[PDB]
Amino acid sequence: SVKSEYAEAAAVGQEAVAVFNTMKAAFQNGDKEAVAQYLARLASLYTRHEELLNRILEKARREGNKEAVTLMNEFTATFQTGKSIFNAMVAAFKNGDDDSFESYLQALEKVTAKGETLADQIAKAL
Numbered sequence: 001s002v003k004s005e006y007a008e009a010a011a012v013g014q015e016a017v018a019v020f021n022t023m024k025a026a027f028q029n030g031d032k033e034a035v036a037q038y039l040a041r042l043a044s045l046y047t048r049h050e051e052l053l054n055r056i057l058e059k060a061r062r063e064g065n066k067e068a069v070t071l072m073n074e075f076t077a078t079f080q081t082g083k084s085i086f087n088a089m090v091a092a093f094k095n096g097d098d099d100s101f102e103s104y105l106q107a108l109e110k111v112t113a114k115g116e117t118l119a120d121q122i123a124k125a126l
């Protein structure tokens, strides 16, 4: 069901949370080789999460589930904010700009924490 597809998508999201926090520790410790690998892992996880979210939104639309579509449109918009900040973080790492990397890292944490009540609302709505 779309609800079980959302729980699978939520688990991929939690995997990125786990990898992100390990990456933050590696960045603080200066282990740039680890950071590079974690950033590649995160890019793959976010790409997967995005695709799963789009399929869920499209299914909710085909089902006529207006409330779930509304929430998923809001949630996918916030997802793109996080993705843009993530991409900027990756660029800051490539460029060696640790100040910008720190900035974007905190921003990605706040954007993600803000979107959590909505994430839970969607599970109930589908």
Ligand SMILES: O=C(O)c1cc2ccccc2o1
Binding pocket: 012, 013, 014, 016, 017, 020, 042, 045, 046, 049, 082, 086, 108, 109, 112
């Ligand atoms: O739900 C997600 O795909 C997600 C959450 C998150 C938090 C920090 C960095 C990357 C992230 O991806």
